[PDB]
Amino acid sequence: QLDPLVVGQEHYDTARGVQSILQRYQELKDIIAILGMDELSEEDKLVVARARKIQRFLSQPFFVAEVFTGSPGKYVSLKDTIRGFKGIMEGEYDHLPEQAFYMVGSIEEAVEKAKKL
Amino acid sequence: AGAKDIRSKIASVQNTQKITKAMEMVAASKMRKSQDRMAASRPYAETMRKVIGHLAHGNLEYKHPYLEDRDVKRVGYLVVSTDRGLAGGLNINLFKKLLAEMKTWTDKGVQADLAMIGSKGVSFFNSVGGNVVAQVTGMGDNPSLSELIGPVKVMLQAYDEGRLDKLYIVSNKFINTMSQVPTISQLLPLPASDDDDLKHKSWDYLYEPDPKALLDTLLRRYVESQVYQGVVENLASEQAARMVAMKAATDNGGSLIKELQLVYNKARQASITQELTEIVSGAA
Amino acid sequence: DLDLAKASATDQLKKAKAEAQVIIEQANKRRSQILDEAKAEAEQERTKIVAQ
Amino acid sequence: DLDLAKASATDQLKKAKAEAQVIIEQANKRRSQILDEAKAEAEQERTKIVAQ
Amino acid sequence: TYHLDVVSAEQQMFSGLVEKIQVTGSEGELGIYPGHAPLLTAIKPGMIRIVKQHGHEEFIYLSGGILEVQPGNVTVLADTAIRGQDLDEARAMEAKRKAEEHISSSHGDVDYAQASAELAKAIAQLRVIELTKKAM
Amino acid sequence: TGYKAVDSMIPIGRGQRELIIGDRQTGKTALAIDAIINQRDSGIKAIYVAIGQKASTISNVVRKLEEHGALANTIVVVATASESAALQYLAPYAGAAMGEYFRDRGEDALIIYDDLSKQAVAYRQISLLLRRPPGREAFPGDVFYLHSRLLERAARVNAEYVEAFTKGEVKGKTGSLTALPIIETQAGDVSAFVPTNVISITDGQIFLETNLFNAGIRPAVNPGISVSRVGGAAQTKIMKKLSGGIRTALAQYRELAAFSQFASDLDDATRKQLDHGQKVTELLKQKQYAPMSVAQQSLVLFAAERGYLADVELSKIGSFEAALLAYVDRDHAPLMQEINQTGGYNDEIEGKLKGILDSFKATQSW
Amino acid sequence: VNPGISVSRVGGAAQTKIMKKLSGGIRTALAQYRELAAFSQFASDLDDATRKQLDHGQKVTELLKQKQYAPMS
């Protein structure tokens, strides 16, 4: 069911963009390992950070995992999910740390954690 | 064993063989470009060496420290090395030749100092414990002279300041597209020329402003060019050595495919029979 | 001025072609809208006639 | 050579003005073709769904 | 006319036939016509004018060098970067510091890096020997 | 089949047996039902035999067949995943008999057997439940003679055979039945048992590659490993002329683009082959239910082969292809008619197609 | 013991809170070591940033080794 005709072009484009960013990061990972990060081009040094933040943001605290972690769970609507990923890929959050996205719910919790962090 | 585990390894060796073929192709192109850049560098050194030979060994031979054999108490080497792996034995052949010639020197009780081009030589000589005193690394495909200036300057300053009494470059000579040899050659005091410029009897230069300062600059620039040439020849030797090494690795992979496919065939036959025998013998 | 005229002709051509493309994409959006209206009408028409 | 330059510049500008007017007129033609075809398909789909 | 070479330590810069040149020798401007007597001089950083025969004029920027002229021939052993007592001492100072520390840079061969890492992952943990009964 | 990739690279003839083979979820069923839908407005009658399919797939298939109007042409034979294995094993033979009725009367039929591998599993179940001895992978001994005696019925029969069978009621016609069996491989191991049997039976295979399918290359036909051994004898002349290079050009492009990843700053001669291959590989994909007529495919391939892409080679080649089709459909329909009726190719038609692309490139946008 | 190929589905629920606190960095250090393990056969081609992870994961692996019949409190 993941095609534009049933999910809409916005959802399809967001998903394909996330996959493309993560694939490009998986490519760059070995150049980073051998050469070191300071050799990457300035647009690749941005793909790296944005992929690393995507890779954090799609983790999530579950209500039932609380007994494993103590932290409360979060329920995220599909609208907030698309809004968050579509914002991250477009650079609206290039100013936040990476750990601002780890184990958060909606992107509002990301900005509020960074403000706290 | 296991038929699937072996087929997975067969695929992984085929993928390795493909990577090594691509590396062979890339190296075989870089070698041509490098050995043409090698030929683009001859005229400067040749025409400067003819000038130096006219000033130094011709008529009215001027006196300079670099020209004459002062007594030796310590020795300096400029060592060229790669920044990269997969080149075969090239750097270790060169460094073992250096350590042998440097040990022969230190039998006589003389001290030795090293300046390094390239990261491999830095790593090896620090593991060995050599006395490296200057270095440049990360030359890549693009060796500049304006980066050689530094370590050559340190070794020239140490010579004229009277510390170093002999100066060498240590490098691989590119000879054939499959033959390269590690060599040590003397830079300073200036090697003797074979040719005699007695046929330049018929003329002399209008030296503006004055010959002695001009001969000083000429000798400094010539040592620099001879070092740059030794770097570019070693870089083309690196590309050819990587080409040959990746060729050999591709043939080793191709043999290992045969040996793994034989083991896979035996495994899948044994699996077919052990299954069909269990089925047939189970039916009372 | 001969080479400036060449740059003016090429700019005029590319400007006109991009200006035509915005007209075409406006037609495509209109088509998508009017077909969605026709579908939603046929959906309601079905629900009424099958209840009857 | 300046008189030749003026002739060539004016001729090429005349060609580019004609080609721009052709491109945009055909873009309007395409747009009209799309909008007619969408009207016909709007009824073709509606009739299909109601017969279904 | 006479033959002119402008040669750097890296690559050649000019090899045409010339009617005259103008240079700034260290001891002043200097204009070489055909047949000029043998001469040797430094030249200062700055432009050289060539007029190729048939009178075509062009300007080449030189970071310095040595000019040497011969019977029917001339050459400009041009430097590739600005040279000086201080610049060269700064470069030697950095070359010394990088060796007194153990700081090293990264080659720019991204192609070698890609192929090296793909081969390093591909060759890892094959277990191909002992699986293959090759002794060696 | 209405697919640019197959109709150019892998031509199918009336009476051929072409194996649609590939891993799970790579467009096998889509490619088969789009071939059926293309058969609408041809003399060919279509049959779809679904073996072991879940009922939702069959519901969707029938809705799409009637939606695109192809259903009035075609017979649908159903043995769903929950029905007794006897019904699944004996289905394709019923479909083959319904098709052979048309074959024996001097008409043309086309039949698709969906998952012959599921028929082989249903025959294995029914065989083991009767205590019959097993074979290489527990499949009974005669599993080859299961698929063989089915696929050998797909044939073209000469006019004397149909004349004698129908007792003289039809004289000039030759009958044919065309089979497109589908086989599902696991991780692309073509050398499995049932796949290498069916590959030893048929006259070609359309190998569908999963890593091309996930990269958005749909349909994901893999050149080189896929062939038609009947070949250009079935192909129409214009398609045979235009398509001669495309398959080898694509295979060498793929190997060169595999090399490319390790070689930046590469020769400017291969830089052009590796662009033109990347454009042709971008051009040959198309949307789910859009079959394309021989004239539309022919002129798109003429555009690709005679260099008219190289400026638009940038991007938006999909919009270029759609606009080119709509332009040619507006003006030069008498030529599309000539091409669709005759399939012939002439220096005069070559000049006409040059004039079409020259007029399109100068005057339209995408 | 081969970590990472070996699983416990009980996890920290069966650990003292000091152990549960301290174990997560061990898990992440060995996971990074396992990912960066391949490059180890070409260690001095690598960058120092990844090198510090590679030689840290070796030191953790060396720290887990333990003699028989010496239980630790």
Ligand SMILES: Nc1ncnc2c1ncn2[C@@H]1O[C@H](COP(=O)(O)OP(=O)(O)OP(=O)(O)O)[C@@H](O)[C@H]1O
């Ligand atoms: N040309 C195409 N363009 C876009 N989507 C396609 C195309 N072909 C197939 N798909 C989509 O890919 C999916 C898989 O297609 P299909 O069902 O034909 O695969 P399959 O191999 O027959 O499946 P299975 O092997 O599981 O029976 C479907 O959702 C289908 O809509």
Ligand SMILES: [Mg+2]
């Ligand atoms: Mg399917």
